[PDB]
Enzyme design. Sequence first.
Site, PDB file in Angstrom:
ATOM      1  N   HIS A   1       0.812  -1.221   0.000  1.00 48.91           N
ATOM      2  CA  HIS A   1       0.000   0.000   0.000  1.00 48.91           C
ATOM      3  C   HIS A   1       0.843   1.267   0.000  1.00 48.91           C
ATOM      4  O   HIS A   1       0.944   1.963   1.001  1.00 48.91           O
ATOM      5  CB  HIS A   1      -0.934  -0.032   1.195  1.00 48.91           C
ATOM      6  CG  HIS A   1      -1.984  -1.086   1.089  1.00 48.91           C
ATOM      7  ND1 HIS A   1      -2.026  -2.179   1.926  1.00 48.91           N
ATOM      8  CD2 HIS A   1      -3.024  -1.222   0.235  1.00 48.91           C
ATOM      9  CE1 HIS A   1      -3.073  -2.924   1.612  1.00 48.91           C
ATOM     10  NE2 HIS A   1      -3.694  -2.365   0.589  1.00 48.91           N
TER      11      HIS A   1
ATOM     12  N   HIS B   1       1.188   1.273  -5.735  1.00 44.79           N
ATOM     13  CA  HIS B   1      -0.152   0.705  -5.736  1.00 44.79           C
ATOM     14  C   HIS B   1      -1.161   1.765  -6.175  1.00 44.79           C
ATOM     15  O   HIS B   1      -2.054   1.482  -6.973  1.00 44.79           O
ATOM     16  CB  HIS B   1      -0.523   0.129  -4.355  1.00 44.79           C
ATOM     17  CG  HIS B   1      -1.980  -0.171  -4.204  1.00 44.79           C
ATOM     18  ND1 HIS B   1      -2.636  -1.096  -4.992  1.00 44.79           N
ATOM     19  CD2 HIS B   1      -2.918   0.358  -3.385  1.00 44.79           C
ATOM     20  CE1 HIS B   1      -3.911  -1.131  -4.656  1.00 44.79           C
ATOM     21  NE2 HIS B   1      -4.116  -0.245  -3.697  1.00 44.79           N
TER      22      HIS B   1
ATOM     23  N   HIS C   1      -6.996   6.935  -2.804  1.00 48.84           N
ATOM     24  CA  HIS C   1      -7.717   5.857  -2.101  1.00 48.84           C
ATOM     25  C   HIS C   1      -7.005   5.133  -0.954  1.00 48.84           C
ATOM     26  O   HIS C   1      -7.685   4.558  -0.105  1.00 48.84           O
ATOM     27  CB  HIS C   1      -8.342   4.856  -3.072  1.00 48.84           C
ATOM     28  CG  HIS C   1      -7.501   3.653  -3.340  1.00 48.84           C
ATOM     29  ND1 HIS C   1      -6.499   3.645  -4.287  1.00 48.84           N
ATOM     30  CD2 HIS C   1      -7.535   2.410  -2.810  1.00 48.84           C
ATOM     31  CE1 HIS C   1      -5.945   2.448  -4.318  1.00 48.84           C
ATOM     32  NE2 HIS C   1      -6.554   1.680  -3.432  1.00 48.84           N
ATOM     33  N   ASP C   2      -5.674   5.161  -0.919  1.00 47.06           N
ATOM     34  CA  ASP C   2      -4.915   4.534   0.162  1.00 47.06           C
ATOM     35  C   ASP C   2      -3.879   5.440   0.784  1.00 47.06           C
ATOM     36  O   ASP C   2      -2.985   4.943   1.479  1.00 47.06           O
ATOM     37  CB  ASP C   2      -4.168   3.300  -0.329  1.00 47.06           C
ATOM     38  CG  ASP C   2      -5.006   2.018  -0.297  1.00 47.06           C
ATOM     39  OD1 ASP C   2      -5.917   1.816   0.547  1.00 47.06           O
ATOM     40  OD2 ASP C   2      -4.764   1.123  -1.095  1.00 47.06           O
TER      41      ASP C   2
ATOM     42  N   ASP D   1      -8.784  -1.915  -7.886  1.00 51.69           N
ATOM     43  CA  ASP D   1      -8.111  -2.229  -6.612  1.00 51.69           C
ATOM     44  C   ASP D   1      -7.795  -3.739  -6.534  1.00 51.69           C
ATOM     45  O   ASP D   1      -6.783  -4.159  -5.954  1.00 51.69           O
ATOM     46  CB  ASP D   1      -9.018  -1.811  -5.447  1.00 51.69           C
ATOM     47  CG  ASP D   1      -8.274  -1.602  -4.150  1.00 51.69           C
ATOM     48  OD1 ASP D   1      -7.097  -1.191  -4.180  1.00 51.69           O
ATOM     49  OD2 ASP D   1      -8.811  -1.823  -3.044  1.00 51.69           O
TER      50      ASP D   1
ATOM     51  N   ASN E   1      -4.718  -6.909  -9.644  1.00 50.39           N
ATOM     52  CA  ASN E   1      -3.385  -7.552  -9.711  1.00 50.39           C
ATOM     53  C   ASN E   1      -3.385  -8.944 -10.372  1.00 50.39           C
ATOM     54  O   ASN E   1      -2.525  -9.213 -11.222  1.00 50.39           O
ATOM     55  CB  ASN E   1      -2.705  -7.706  -8.333  1.00 50.39           C
ATOM     56  CG  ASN E   1      -2.542  -6.394  -7.552  1.00 50.39           C
ATOM     57  OD1 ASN E   1      -2.539  -6.418  -6.311  1.00 50.39           O
ATOM     58  ND2 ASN E   1      -2.369  -5.272  -8.245  1.00 50.39           N
TER      59      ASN E   1
ATOM     60  N   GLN F   1      -3.420 -17.597  -2.985  1.00 51.74           N
ATOM     61  CA  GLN F   1      -3.709 -16.921  -4.253  1.00 51.74           C
ATOM     62  C   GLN F   1      -4.838 -17.585  -5.012  1.00 51.74           C
ATOM     63  O   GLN F   1      -5.692 -16.890  -5.574  1.00 51.74           O
ATOM     64  CB  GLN F   1      -2.462 -16.812  -5.142  1.00 51.74           C
ATOM     65  CG  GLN F   1      -1.483 -15.763  -4.637  1.00 51.74           C
ATOM     66  CD  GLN F   1      -2.172 -14.463  -4.328  1.00 51.74           C
ATOM     67  OE1 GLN F   1      -2.824 -13.876  -5.202  1.00 51.74           O
ATOM     68  NE2 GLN F   1      -2.099 -14.037  -3.069  1.00 51.74           N
TER      69      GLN F   1
ATOM     70  N   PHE G   1      -7.949 -16.600  -3.177  1.00 52.28           N
ATOM     71  CA  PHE G   1      -8.234 -15.196  -3.453  1.00 52.28           C
ATOM     72  C   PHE G   1      -8.941 -15.082  -4.805  1.00 52.28           C
ATOM     73  O   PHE G   1      -9.967 -14.403  -4.905  1.00 52.28           O
ATOM     74  CB  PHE G   1      -6.934 -14.396  -3.453  1.00 52.28           C
ATOM     75  CG  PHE G   1      -7.099 -12.897  -3.601  1.00 52.28           C
ATOM     76  CD1 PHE G   1      -8.092 -12.201  -2.918  1.00 52.28           C
ATOM     77  CD2 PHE G   1      -6.223 -12.181  -4.412  1.00 52.28           C
ATOM     78  CE1 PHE G   1      -8.218 -10.828  -3.063  1.00 52.28           C
ATOM     79  CE2 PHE G   1      -6.343 -10.794  -4.550  1.00 52.28           C
ATOM     80  CZ  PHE G   1      -7.330 -10.125  -3.873  1.00 52.28           C
TER      81      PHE G   1
HETATM   82  C1  LIG Z   1      -1.558  -9.606  -5.293  1.00 55.03           C
HETATM   83  C2  LIG Z   1      -2.213 -10.533  -4.256  1.00 55.03           C
HETATM   84  O1  LIG Z   1      -3.042  -9.767  -3.357  1.00 55.03           O
HETATM   85  C3  LIG Z   1      -3.672 -10.426  -2.385  1.00 55.03           C
HETATM   86  O2  LIG Z   1      -3.525 -11.611  -2.194  1.00 55.03           O
HETATM   87  C4  LIG Z   1      -4.647  -9.652  -1.547  1.00 55.03           C
HETATM   88  C5  LIG Z   1      -5.511 -10.136  -0.563  1.00 55.03           C
HETATM   89  C6  LIG Z   1      -5.692 -11.551  -0.035  1.00 55.03           C
HETATM   90  N1  LIG Z   1      -6.230  -9.119  -0.074  1.00 55.03           N
HETATM   91  N2  LIG Z   1      -5.861  -8.013  -0.707  1.00 55.03           N
HETATM   92  C7  LIG Z   1      -6.419  -6.814  -0.485  1.00 55.03           C
HETATM   93  C8  LIG Z   1      -7.459  -6.438  -1.354  1.00 55.03           C
HETATM   94  C9  LIG Z   1      -8.094  -5.209  -1.200  1.00 55.03           C
HETATM   95  C10 LIG Z   1      -7.712  -4.350  -0.173  1.00 55.03           C
HETATM   96  N3  LIG Z   1      -8.352  -3.172  -0.053  1.00 55.03           N
HETATM   97  C11 LIG Z   1      -6.676  -4.725   0.721  1.00 55.03           C
HETATM   98  C12 LIG Z   1      -6.022  -5.957   0.559  1.00 55.03           C
HETATM   99  C13 LIG Z   1      -4.913  -8.283  -1.613  1.00 55.03           C
HETATM  100  C14 LIG Z   1      -4.246  -7.260  -2.523  1.00 55.03           C
HETATM  101 MG   LIG Z   2      -7.608   0.478   0.754  1.00 59.42          MG
HETATM  102 ZN   LIG Z   3      -5.958  -0.150  -2.459  1.00 60.73          ZN
END
Ligand SMILES: CCOC(=O)c1c(C)nn(-c2ccc(N)cc2)c1C
Ligand SMILES: [Mg+2]
Ligand SMILES: [Zn+2]
Length: 326
Positions: free
Chosen positions: A75, A79, A115-116, A233, A236, A284, A287
Site C-alpha cells: 500500500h 499501488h 484511495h490509500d 483495486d 493484480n 492466491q 483469493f
Molecule cells: C496480489 C495478491 O493480493 C492479495 O492476495 C490480496 C488479498 C488476499 N487481499 N488483498 C487486499 C485487497 C483489497 C484491499 N483493499 C486490501 C487488501 C490483496 C491485494
Molecule cells: Mg484500501
Molecule cells: Zn488499495
Amino acid sequence: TEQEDVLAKELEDVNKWGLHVFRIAELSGNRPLTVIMHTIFQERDLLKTFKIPVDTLITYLMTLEDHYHADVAYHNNIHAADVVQSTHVLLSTPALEAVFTDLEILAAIFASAIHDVDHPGVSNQFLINTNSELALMYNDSSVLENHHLAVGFKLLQEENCDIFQNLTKKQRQSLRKMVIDIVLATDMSKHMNLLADLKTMVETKKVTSSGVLLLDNYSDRIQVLQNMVHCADLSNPTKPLQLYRQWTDRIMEEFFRQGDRERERGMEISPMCDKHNASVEKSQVGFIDYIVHPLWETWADLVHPDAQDILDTLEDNREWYQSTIP
Ligand SMILES: CCOC(=O)c1c(C)nn(-c2ccc(N)cc2)c1C
Ligand SMILES: [Mg+2]
Ligand SMILES: [Zn+2]
C-alpha cells in the site's frame, strides 16, 4: 537524458492493461503516481477542461505521493499509481463510451489517486483490536478509508495545491460526494454487497443497439464507478504474470510484518500474516476463486465483451498458481 527518454517510451503504454508500473517507478525517481496522473490528465485533456494550472497539479501530486509511505511494501505510491492507471483503462471501455461526464471521470481518477494515502501497512481489524487512535476517531467503521479521504482532501489546502480552484461550487460539491462514495467502497467489508447489487444491475441491464450502457440516475452511475475502482483495486491477478507475482510478493511482505506485530503483542495472528505457517500459492488460488474472479466475471458481463482479455489473463494466472501447488 537517456532515463527521461525511456520513461516517456514506457508512458506511451498508459492506455494499455499491463503498463510496466514498477519500471516507471524506477525511471521517475520513485514518482510513479505523479508522472502517471500527469500523463493521464494531459491525455484526457483534463487541465484545459477544468482550468487546472499545470504547476498546481504537479505540486499537489508530489505532496500527495509524499504522504504514501516508502517503507510499506504494498500500500504505497506504486499501488496508487496502478489503481489510477487501471481505472483510466476501464473508463475507456467501449460499453462505457460517452456514458460518464468529465466531472465523473475526474472524480474516479482522483479517488483512485488518494484511495490509500497514508496507509500504515496494517488492516482495519488490526487497528480496532489494538485500540488505535484511528479506530477511536472513526468508531470502528471503514477506519482506513475515512482516513485516506481526510488526508487526500486536506492536502488540497496546502500552498498551490488546490487543483479544483476553477470548478464551480456545485461542481466541487458533486466531485467531493462522488469521491467519498468511491473510496468508502474500497473497504473489503463492503465487497459482498457491492457485488450483489452489481449482479442485480447486470440482470436488469439496458443498452443501446451498439451495447453501450444506459445509466440515468445517480444511484446507478455511482454504483458502476464504485465497482470500477473496486475492480481496479482487485486487478493484480488479471495483469501479466510478471506483474502479479511482484504484487503478491509485496502484499505477503506487508501481511507478514503485521503478523510479526501481532505475535509480539500476544494476539491471534490474522489470515495470511503468519510467515511460519503460510501457503502463498493456495492463498492466491483462494483469493481468485472466492473474491477476484466472481467480481471480474460479473464486470465482464456488464460490459460484454470488452473485458474478455482481462478475464482470460485472470484464468491463465489462476491455472499457473494452481500448477505450483504439488
Ligand atoms: C496480489 C495478491 O493480493 C492479495 O492476495 C490480496 C488479498 C488476499 N487481499 N488483498 C487486499 C485487497 C483489497 C484491499 N483493499 C486490501 C487488501 C490483496 C491485494
Ligand atoms: Mg484500501
Ligand atoms: Zn488499495
